[PDB]
Design a binder for this molecule. Structure first.
Ligand SMILES: NC(=O)c1ccc[n+]([C@@H]2O[C@H](COP(=O)([O-])OP(=O)(O)OC[C@H]3O[C@@H](n4cnc5c(N)ncnc54)[C@H](O)[C@@H]3O)[C@@H](O)[C@H]2O)c1
Ligand SMILES: NC(=O)c1ccc[n+]([C@@H]2O[C@H](COP(=O)([O-])OP(=O)(O)OC[C@H]3O[C@@H](n4cnc5c(N)ncnc54)[C@H](O)[C@@H]3O)[C@@H](O)[C@H]2O)c1
Ligand SMILES: NC(=O)c1ccc[n+]([C@@H]2O[C@H](COP(=O)([O-])OP(=O)(O)OC[C@H]3O[C@@H](n4cnc5c(N)ncnc54)[C@H](O)[C@@H]3O)[C@@H](O)[C@H]2O)c1
Ligand SMILES: NC(=O)c1ccc[n+]([C@@H]2O[C@H](COP(=O)([O-])OP(=O)(O)OC[C@H]3O[C@@H](n4cnc5c(N)ncnc54)[C@H](O)[C@@H]3O)[C@@H](O)[C@H]2O)c1
Ligand SMILES: O=P(O)(O)OC[C@H]1O[C@](O)(COP(=O)(O)O)[C@@H](O)[C@@H]1O
Ligand SMILES: O=P(O)(O)OC[C@H]1O[C@](O)(COP(=O)(O)O)[C@@H](O)[C@@H]1O
Lengths: 301, 301, 301, 301
């Protein structure tokens, strides 16, 4: 035919998060063609140069730098960004989707911009798209930060820690302690459990503390953001803690929010209802409610 | 025993080049333990946090943030940096080596700081170390940029292009056209050869052009810098175009300079003398001479 | 120095299991140097040829084909093999260890030969070695077969299934249902639980059924056998269900047996006592007792 | 939609070569879905079991075990096999293609069965398919065996050796010495060149010698066979020495034969005419002629 390309990824916003994500992909042999778009076209040119000179050294991807690329483009990751935030980004966002949509996009969205659950909701309303194809970054990094600290604690690997952070990827989020294991051993390894509400405070004050000695978080997210990518593209059917549309599940009804979902090559398969505890349902409820608010408050632009 | 670690890497300088290198390693499953040092300790703390939260998502490395780490530390990559440059960095450098040396280091150095061939020479004089264990970054990125453009041209993969950039990683460097193939087909695919002195001008004005729309090159080098790393650590016995000490080979005698060398787990094995052409010997000679100059000019501090 | 090699692996027995293991390693970029030994030296020559011609295509290992290789050899995997079995192999085995031991080995053993828990015990008695450095293959494949069927069932990935098979890697083994999750959701997704005692019967009759249409299992084990390898060599601190020496834990006292252990670059770190249920303690007890028997029964040779 | 799968591979013949190829893929994270077909359905069941139990340990592929799978099946690798050979396999083959063709296949063929150039020609005649979509295994392993021995010799890595074996993957093949480098240094490192006609005799008597201490070659080919796979599926635009249809190039006209071709996601891009030497054109000519013979001799069935 021509020169094909069955695994394409467009990043809108080639800033710290966008670029480090890209370098993630590439260094990891994940996508096939990677387009890169930025209002700051000159920054895209530079990034894309840079990426193309190291290429040879990695294992084989393509890197290009409008939206006309989003049309047989398997997925679009929006890394672009500014309640006078929620209104700024909604604003920003309102042109991004439209623009990509207006190219006859048929794929998936990966939103990672703050405030994610919200910008994720907005991306859907603006997309038209079914809510199984519009994915938030959500509490993914949170769960990693958590899994890390714990694993760190216990001396095993974060990879044997099984604990989720659910709720608003922000202040309102909560650790599901009731269901948190190391392999199959509950945290019955310590009692009070359900030193550790310590672990979770760091897990939660992490952004602030990283920003404060370095100006920003960007490596972390991209790792997380490259995981979902991997899940989507490879039909993994994996259970990542994303930013999913609540169905009526957890008994919430028109909020996007940080939840275990099953990812694979067609968006989300299904949300999971971990059997949340007493105080969790209340935490979750509060959290979902903090969002469902900003949702009706804001919007407009 | 304790908790071991047979593959350690210390980066002095956790700036753009340092950090992107690190993220390179990690995303690529290359070292085992990665220490990170920076005069700006706060930037190291932040980077190291950031790296540690995404970890779980990659395949298994350790990340820590003095020099006391350089003592069973397999290799030290100096990413730190400012003729009132050559004197600044020599200056900077003069404390780095000493400091790491004073820890009872026994390993290899990877210099990537400009002006590399020079800072590479200086690192040796300051190291004490045999010149087979002090490696410059040298014309590695150049050769990649070259291999890329060509491969790009010919429509094959940079990975089938065989062409070297030798000489000063800078202005004075030269493309070895006389010996430049695509697989085994010389560039006898086009004539004039030994559109293409075009390819090489871009290869050579690349830094300027990338810096100018983005402020700096950092992804490229790290790819290159992660290749050598791979070579060293894995005993590859590979022929990379490094920043090697000229022996009397190419008939030059006390200059570090961009040359094909054979890398593997013990430093450099041996330099290669590609059979350079007439005009090349003259280019090479000029180039080596531009350095051997700055070498006796500068120094002091 | 010479030409080093910090990651070496000797396989005694280059049969189906040995060779497929090797091809596993290599295709997976895991060890650095791989020696291969077999009473049938001619089969080693052939395998090692074969492996060396494809090499170039994989990412960089070395393959050689006595025991004098076991002396700075990081680990030795015994893939060699024939109660007139237990006496045959003990017999076989009794020369293997001795021979490798007599080379001044200082490393770890990976036994995968049936009957593993037993040949694993024997390898220890014969090694001299601390029981944290003599590792059985144990119920690793079992747990995989299990994780697979379940994951298969539930439609997620085996990688989100958390369920262990503990006890004798054989007839007497038991599934720890009481502690078996999908992420963090117990199997409270179905009731009777603690269609599924179906899943576990296949998990347990798998060898017989694979052997019967193909003569043998060899891919499976090597995957499993390459996982532990990965764990050992990379200091993973991972929780694999190995063939560990019971301490007095599970309240058993001089039996090697299939248990969660924490693996990393120095043997086993520590065994875990999952909080086994009523009927499990009884199953476990019976199982451990089936072994502790064959142990005093057999031996001699 | 359903559960997709954009990277599928059907192997007809799940023998030594077929299975080791599969294990290659899987252990290497290359295809996405891998179907496996064999006249000996019971051997497919067993292999596919075996593969599925280790899965979890590798990074994510699917394995299933008629031809109805070849219909959105990206590629079909024929590993199946018996002049009363050429007539047996042609015979065998004549049903394979037909059968897969009769499923509405639209993809590529990878023939690896001996006598390959011939069975590759036959697969085309029987396919209907354009000759850019019917690929022979050809002199790939030969070139590897060659690259290996040399690299072995010179002490560098086979990966820096650039030398091709062209012609019949068999007796009649020839080493293109005239164009054979190490990086960019011709073999002007030794003279007589165009100890070494030694290297090439081993390169050529390798099968016989491996078969004779082990019954067969199967790891080697699968490495090679997994390289092309990688090339096809990832649009590499790489220059592998395949089994291509000669155009009139090398001035030959209706023979499939071992040649440098450029591989990528749509079959072959283009054949290359290395500038073959005097004695080579004569060797090549003889070789091509040995085939063009068996071609008109045989056929029928
Ligand atoms: N979900 C998480 O865990 C998480 C983690 C980290 C950062 N983030 C978010 O990433 C977003 C941006 O991250 P960053 O730190 O890399 O930002 P940044 O300051 O580097 O800016 C990113 C880029 O956005 C591009 N951009 C902005 N508006 C654009 C538009 N209208 N069209 C095209 N390109 C446009 C800019 O030109 C810039 O290059 C923020 O909302 C931030 O919070 C989210
Ligand atoms: N060889 C090549 O191809 C090449 C390519 C790109 C950049 N580089 C070189 O990398 C060097 C630095 O690169 P960059 O763009 O990332 O720089 P940068 O501006 O980001 O600074 C790097 C870091 O050096 C640390 N540092 C400086 N002095 C220090 C000291 N005395 N001890 C410890 N840490 C110290 C700083 O705190 C800073 O974080 C430059 O010389 C640059 O030219 C070389
Ligand atoms: N733990 C598990 O899950 C598991 C799984 C599969 C198979 N295995 C075991 O692997 C063992 C062998 O497996 P296989 O199917 O590949 O066997 P195999 O029939 O192919 O024989 C393996 C090899 O052992 C070599 N060998 C035998 N005695 C030797 C000695 N004294 N010194 C050196 N080499 C010697 C032979 O020459 C042969 O090449 C068996 O006990 C089998 O049950 C264990
Ligand atoms: N090109 C090369 O470098 C190269 C290298 C090695 C081997 N090979 C070739 O591989 C071919 C087979 O290799 P092997 O050693 O693995 O063979 P093998 O003896 O193991 O047989 C392979 C399989 O073919 C299956 N098969 C045979 N006829 C079939 C049919 N009509 N339909 C479906 N399945 C069928 C059999 O049931 C068997 O499982 C041979 O021609 C051999 O020379 C080629
Ligand atoms: O062109 P060939 O002989 O097929 O070899 C390709 C190999 O050569 C390389 O391009 C190395 O090239 P150089 O010889 O320039 O170092 C590898 O990256 C690649 O795997
Ligand atoms: O289910 P989670 O918490 O998302 O974690 C998945 C991780 O757990 C594992 O399945 C390990 O599981 P186990 O706890 O049974 O050892 C890894 O293979 C995988 O990466």
């Amino acid at each position: 035919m021509k020169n094909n390309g069955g695994a394409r990824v467009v990043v809108i916003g080639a800033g710290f998060v966008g670029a480090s994500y890209v370098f993630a992909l590439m260094n990891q042999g994940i996508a096939d063609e990677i387009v890169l778009i930025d209002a700051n076209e000159s920054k895209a040119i530079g990034d894309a140069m840079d990426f193309n000179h190291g290429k040879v050294f990695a294992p084989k991807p393509v890197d290009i730098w409008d939206y006309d690329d989003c049309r047989d483009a398997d997925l679009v990751v929006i890394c672009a960004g500014a309640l006078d935030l929620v209104d700024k980004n909604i604003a920003i966002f309102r042109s991004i989707v439209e623009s990509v949509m207006a190219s006859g996009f048929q794929g998936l969205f990966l939103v990672a911009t703050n405030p994610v659950d919200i910008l994720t909701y907005a991306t859907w309303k603006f997309s038209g798209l079914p809510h199984e194809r519009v994915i938030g970054s959500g509490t993914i990094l949170d769960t990693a930060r958590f899994r890390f600290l714990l694993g760190e604690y216990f001396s095993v690997a974060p990879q044997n820690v099984h604990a989720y952070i659910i709720g608003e990827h922000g202040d309102t989020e909560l650790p599901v302690w009731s269901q948190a294991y190391i392999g199959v051993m509950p945290i019955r390894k310590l009692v009070e459990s359900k030193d550790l509400e310590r672990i979770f405070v760091n897990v939660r004050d992490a952004a602030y503390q990283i920003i404060e000695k370095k100006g920003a978080t960007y490596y972390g997210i991209a790792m997380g953001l490259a995981r979902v990518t991997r899940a989507i593209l490879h039909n993994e059917n994996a259970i990542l803690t994303v930013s999913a549309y609540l169905d009526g599940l957890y008994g919430e009804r028109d909020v996007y929010i940080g939840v275990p979902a099953v990812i694979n090559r067609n968006g989300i398969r299904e949300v999971i209802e971990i059997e949340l505890n007493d105080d969790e349902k209340n935490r979750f409820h509060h959290s979902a409610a903090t969002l469902k608010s900003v949702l009706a408050r804001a919007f407009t632009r």
